[PDB]
Ligand SMILES: N[C@@H](CCS)C(=O)O
């Protein structure tokens with residue numbers, strides 16, 4: 338039974354219940370993520386920015402089946418075009434706006450990757466992607482406002498592929514944590 342998370346801590350407790358089994362009800366998880374009203378005081382500890390690129394800040398290591406982190410995007414910071422390593426990926430906005438651009442999986446033939454669509458993800462909204470849906474790029478295109486997003490991945494993964502927009506060629510990237518549980522992890 339899905340109740341509104343009152344705080345980030347409450348959300349985390351609810352997620353441990355939603356991931357107590359072996360499968361994932363995506364619509365339920367997205368609904369409860371969207372229902373949490375971002376409260377900056379609750380997540381300030383994890384919102385550690387870097388001047389030059391976006392940072393990944395682990396919030397909860399989950400129960401073996403998921404993990405929850407906060408990404409901090411300076412003005413103009415964005416990602417590669419990337420996949421999600423056969424995992425579920427949820428993205429909720431905590432502050433600001435992000436542009437999400439969708440791409441199809443490339444064919445083996447070298448070719449420009451043409452965007453299939455784009456949208457602006459706004460404060461408190463929760464987006465979802467998986468590899469069956471496609472690839473995406475996420476960017477803070479603002480010149481004046483940093484963005485903060487809450488990401489849930491299930492199962493957890495620490496590698497993915499970046500895709501070259503000119504060719505569709507991919508390269509494996511290992512993702513690192515800027516911090517864990519509020520502690521900077523150089
Ligand atoms: N998957 C990316 C962010 C957009 S989902 C990452 O964890 O670095």
Ligand SMILES: [Fe+3]
Pocket residue numbers: 419420421426473475
């Ligand atoms: Fe992503």
